[PDB]
C-alpha cells in the first residue's frame, strides 16, 4: 500500500510500451512526447550515403514525423534497459524490430533520454531520441 | 483527521498521489488511443 | 480515539512513502527530544549510537542520503503505551539506490502532541539492518 | 537518575536470565494493563492478540512453555522515552528446549513507577521471530 | 487421437516459443470463456483475479510487457482429463527482458473442439512464481 | 453451486489432512479413471511416470508410505473447468517422517460425480518436489 | 454439503477432530487443576 | 486449517507440561495418567541402600503416589526429548529439578513411554514411568 | 526396422505430429512465424 | 548390412528431430561406456568436460536444456569404422532458445548394439560450435 | 586515578548499578536465585 | 608507581565486572598489536586462533557472546615483567549462559599506554578452560 515512486527501470519500460503502442496506433500524436529542446533522429538517410542529421525542437520534429508516413507500423521489442541519470532523468536503451507500411521487419537500435518536466511530479518528456536501423549503417 | 508530525491533513496523499506520467499525455490518456484492438 | 493498530499502520505507510519519495522532509516527523538511529557502524564495528534533536536527525538523514528507497513491509505490530502513545514494531526489506533488498528490524515510538487531536510525532526511531549486527 | 542504556542493559540481562532459569516467575516483571504480544501463529497465522494484565501474561508464558530457553543476545539498543521511560530493542537468537537457534527481535518499553524511584515495570513487550515473517 | 503427452509437449513448445517471439499473438491460443491468471500479484498483494474472454486475455498479456521472455523448461507432465482434455503441469524458469531467471509453475487445461479434430484451445492457464509465495 | 475457490480450498484441506491422519484411505479420493504422480525418480534420473487406476494409485501411495506428513500450504488457487470441474494449483512445503520440509508444486483436477451434488473425485494428481527437477 | 470421494460429509472432521488428551483427563480438565494458582 | 494430528515431540511436551502441572497442584489425580499395564518407579530407596523396585499397575501405583505424600512440589524441566516408537506410542526423555514439601531442588532424570488408548483418537496413557534422582544414584 | 537405443519403429515418428494445431493457428503458421524472424 | 551413408542419414534425421521435439528423451540414444562432450557449462563455461553413461548424459543434456532448438543441416558425412561401426560428421546451423543460427560440428561414432540387427547406439558424441572456437 | 583503555574515572562503576531493581524483586535476589542452585 | 599486585587486582576485578555486565565494550581493554587467544571454534572447537587489534578482538568476543557470566575468582597472581609491564595469571570458575561452573586460567600481560600514568591496556590475553585439556 506504500505508494513509493516508480523506479527508473519501470519508468523506462512503461515509456517504451507507451511510445511504441502510440506509434503503432496514432503516429500523429507522437509529437506530444517531446519538448522544446528535444533532439530527435529516426533512421534517416540523406542523398549522400551517410545517416541523416537530427532535428532539435518541436515544430520541425513534428514535420519530420509527418515526413515519414508511419502507417500500420509493427514493432517488436527485444531489449529495453533503463537507468537513472542527471536531474532524475532516465536514459533508456532499446533494441528490436520495426516494420513500416507492412514491409519486412528491420533491426532497429535506439536510445532515449527522458527528463522530468519539474512542475508536475512523475511526468517525463523525451529530451533525446536517437534511432537507427542497423541496416543502413552496418 | 489523523495527522503525523507537523504535516497538514491530506498533505501526505497530496504529495504521494501522483500517477506515473509520460510526455504531455494525461495519466490514463495514452492507453485510450489503443483500445478497439484484438 | 482511533485504534493504535490503525495509527501505527498509517504512520508506517506514510513514513516509508516519504522516506522514498521526499527524504528531505523526513525530519519533519520528529521532535525536540526525539532519538534516531538508522544502522551505522563505527571503526570497531559497534552499531552507531543514536542522535538526538530534530536538526541532528535531519543531518543524519542527509548523511544517509536515501535515494529512491524501495521498501517491502513484511510485518507491522502497533500497540498502546504511556500517555496514549504508540509503539510500532516493523520488520521488512529496504534497499536504497536500487540495489538488492536488505532485511531490516525497526521500532518506532510515537507520542501525542497534546495540543492537536490525533497528532503524533516520532519520539523514538530505532533501525537495524539484520546482516550488520547478526 | 540512571542512563536509559543502563536500565535497558540491566533489564535485558535480568529478563534473559530469568527466562532461562525460572520462566514461571516472569509474570512479576510486568504490571497492570501491560501488553505482552509474544506469540507464534494463530488461525490467521500472522497476528497474535495481545494479553493484558499479569493473569493473562502468566497464562500465556505457561502456554509458551520455555524449557532451558537459551538466549543469544546479538544486540541491544536502549533510548529514553515518555515519562522518563526506556525503550529497548534487543535482537538475537532464541533456542527453546535446546533446539535450533532462531533469529528474533523483542521490544520492551520499561515504564517507571511513581511510588518508588528507579523502579521499572514492562508496560509493552513485543516479540517476533524472523522465520515466521520472512 | 494423439497421446496426451504428445499434445502437452507440442503445446508447451508452441506456447513458450510464441511467447518469446510474438507475445501479442498469444491471445489466439485461448477461446471464449477461458480462464487466464498469470497475475501472480495485484494492487492489494493478492493473486490476480482470472480474466475471461479473448479480449481480456490479450489486454492482460499486453500489460505484462513480455520482451524477449526466455523460458527454461525443467519439466512438462501431461495427463488425460475429462472430456478428452489434457492437463499439463510445466515447471521451470522464466526471465523477462533478460532479467534474472525466476522459478515458475504453470497449469494448462486444454479443451478440444467437437468440430475440428486434433485442435485444442486453452481452457485454463494458471501461472505462479516460486518467490512470490515462498 | 458453491464457488470453485471454496471447493478447491476444502479439498486441499481434506487431502492434506488425510495425507498424515490416515494415508490408508487416500485412494478413496481417486476415481477409476484417475492419474497420479507424486514426485518419484528412476535410475536414469527422469521423474517417475504417473500411474492410472484407483488400485494402482493405492499401491503407489503405500509404496510412498507417508508417515505423519506435515504440510504448510503457502498458496492454493482453484478455478472452474470443463463439466463444472475444478483445477487446483497448490504450492507449499511437505515434510515426510518428521524430516526437513521440502518445497513442492501440485495440480489437482477434480471432476464431479454426476450422481450427487457437490461431490468430486481426483481425476488428476500431479505432485512434484522442487529440488528433484530444478 | 461439499463432499469428496466416498467420504460422507463431516466424515473427515469426526475422524480428524479429536484433540490430544492424556491418561483419561478429558482435554481441558487438567488445565483448571493446573491453573489453580492465584 | 489443516488438522494434522500432533507430532510425537509436541505430544511429549504437552504431556510433560500436564504431568508436572497436575503433580504440582493435585498429585492425587496423578493415578489417572496411567493404565492397567503401567510400570512406575519414582526415585525410591528401600531399606537396603539399592534403588527401589517398580510398581506394575493402577491401585498400587495410586498407593505409592500417596506414599511419597507429594505436596507443594516445585518442578523445573531442563530438557524434554520426545520421539515416536512402536504402535504409534511416544518415548519421552526428561531431565530437570524437582523439590517435594519445599525441600531443596533435586537433580532428576525420567523416561516416559506413552501409548494410545485405542478407542479415542489422540489419547495417550503412561505405559512406562522411570524417574530417578541423581544423588540416589550418583 | 533400423532403430537406435531403446527405440522401436513408431515412437518418435508419432511423437512428431505435424497435424496438431492449437487455437485458430493454421498448421505450421506458428512455426514459420518463429523461423526467419 | 545397411549402407554406412544410409545409417548416417537415418541417425542424423532421427537424432535432430528428437532433439528439437523431446530433449528429455535424448539420453535414450546412448548407453554405457558412451562419451558425450558438448559446448560445456562451468563458472565460465570454457571447460567442457566429457560425461559418460546415460545418467550423466541425460543430466548434462537437461542442464543444457535445449528449447525449440531449430537445426538446419548443411552437410552429413557417414563412413565405416571398426567393429562395423559408423562414424558421422555433421555440419549445420543450430539456433537454441530462438537465438541466431550458429555454425557447428557434431561428430558421432556409432557402434552396433550386437543383439538386434540394424541397431546402433551413440558410443561417442563430440559437439563443437564455430564462434566459440574461431 | 588508575584506569585502563579509554575509560575515565568510574564509568564502569556507574555502569554496575547494584541498586537497580525491576518488578517486585528485592535487590539482587534474582542474581542469588540464578548463580547458586 | 603503583604496586604490581595492586594493579593486577584492580584489573582483574574491573575486567571480570565488565565481562559479566557489558560484554559489548570488552574490546576497550585492548588496543593495537594486542594478542587475544580465548578458546573458540573454527570447525570443531579445537582449532583456536589468536586475533589482533580491537577490530578482531571485539569480533571474536561478540562471536563468543558471553551472556550473564558469573566469574568467581579463586586466585590472582600479579608480577612485574619487562619495561614496567604487569603479568596477571588468574584462576577461577566461569559459568556462561547459566551453564555449569567450569575452571579456567587467564594469563594477562598488561603494558602501560605511555601517555597517562597508571594506565594499562591488555597487550596479551591467553584464556584456557581447564576442561579442554585433561
Numbering used by the authors:
A (entry chain G), H (entry chain R): 1 to 138
B (entry chain K), G (entry chain W): 472 to 509
C (entry chain F), D (entry chain E), E (entry chain T), F (entry chain S), J (entry chain M), L (entry chain D): 5 to 138
I (entry chain X), K (entry chain J): 472 to 508
Manuscript excerpt for this entry:
The interaction between CHIKV nsP3 and host G3BP1 is critical for viral replication.
CHIKV-43 interacts with the NTF2L domain to form a high-order oligomer within a double-layer ring scaffold. However, the flexible loops between α1 and motif 2 in the CHIKV-43 peptides exhibit conformational variability. This suggests that the CHIKV-43 peptide may drive the observed differences.
